[PDB]
């Protein structure tokens with residue numbers, strides 16, 4: 001049916017000549033992290049401030065995510081590093097996130 | 103190197119000073135807040151009056167002045183943050199910018215040219231002048 | 242006088258901060274680049290590391306601070322440039 | 330001659346319209362990216 005072929009042959013949203021697409025491809029290439037525009041944000045939110053079990057689960061999660069080479073191209077930890085940890089955490093400490101490049 | 107981190111912090115500040123920009127994140131600002139122990143009461147380093155000054159400049163996140171010694175590029179707990187923000191050969195640095203309101207409004211889209219202009223005027227007259235400025239994102 | 246040269250450097254930087262302007266040239270900046278050894282670590286002065294801050298603040302041509310002590314107005318290497326920029 | 334260009338005024342008007350439109354289109358195609 002028409003929808004199957006339309007889903008097979010989908011085309012990008014932005015042209016290759018778009019300065020933002022040029023910029024995103026170049027940024028991803030220079031930092032050795034993929035040639036795409038996609039990126040998801042795995043937010044994890046806790047009803048109480050995120051503790052050490054949260055960090056253990058998060059470490060396991062990023063381990064499982066990095067291992068899949070087919071779809072996950074990279075991810076910026078920023079929370080598994082104490083120097084940048086507070087850059088991936090809400091002010092009240094109940095939420096944290098990690099960006100994954102697809 | 104310590105010389106080109108002053109220009110990196112200058113770019114970070116010049117971007118953070120754009121209107122609808124909040125929470126710029128750089129290597130000299132690894133969590134949107136400046137690195138402690140880098141403001142002016144620490145470039146100057148009896149002490150009980152020069153310690154309260156450093157503590158008043160650390161409690162305010164004051165980052166008008168800034169210095170990071172060359173002793174941090176071999177600090178083993180700094181390389182995992184140095185790899186995220188600088189290219190593996192150090193030739194390119196990246197800043198992660200957040201907006202205040204809606205990124206995809208009419209204003210969050212008019213802020214893109216302003217971010218590029220701010221970053222361009224920050225390196226004017228510095229040894230990084232003439233560098234290529236790439237701005238990717240969703241807005 | 243060293244008091245008014247701070248306002249002069251302030252005017253130089255405020256003009257340099259205009260968007261389409263490059264290479265402002267003033268007495269406190271006689272070649273579009275700030276004068277060396279006037280930055281923030283040179284009004285401060287364990288020593289070999291402070292000499293590293295001194296060169297890091299000059300290898301970036303930083304100009305967030307400027308003093309230029311008052312005994313440079315009698316330096317003969319200064320008058321030929323001071324006559325080009327300030328009135329007689 | 331005017332007598333013969335007014336039996337073929339429709340194809341001539343079509344040519345001039347298509348030419349102006351095509352030039353304007355190939356001019357506007359260049360603005361994006363640049």
Ligand SMILES: CCCCCCCCCCCCCCCCCC(=O)O[C@@H](COC(=O)CCCCCCCCCCCCCCC)COP(=O)(O)OCCN
Pocket residue numbers: 334335336338339342346
């Ligand atoms: C979005 C695109 C729009 C672009 C185009 C805008 C419109 C442009 C209008 C230009 C008018 C040119 C057409 C001239 C028609 C001439 C008529 C003619 O030559 O023959 C008639 C002769 O009748 C006359 O006497 C007309 C003589 C006057 C012609 C003078 C041209 C006037 C130009 C008008 C200027 C308006 C331009 C507006 C531009 C924005 C009768 O011939 P026929 O019955 O045998 O043909 C029919 C069978 N195919």
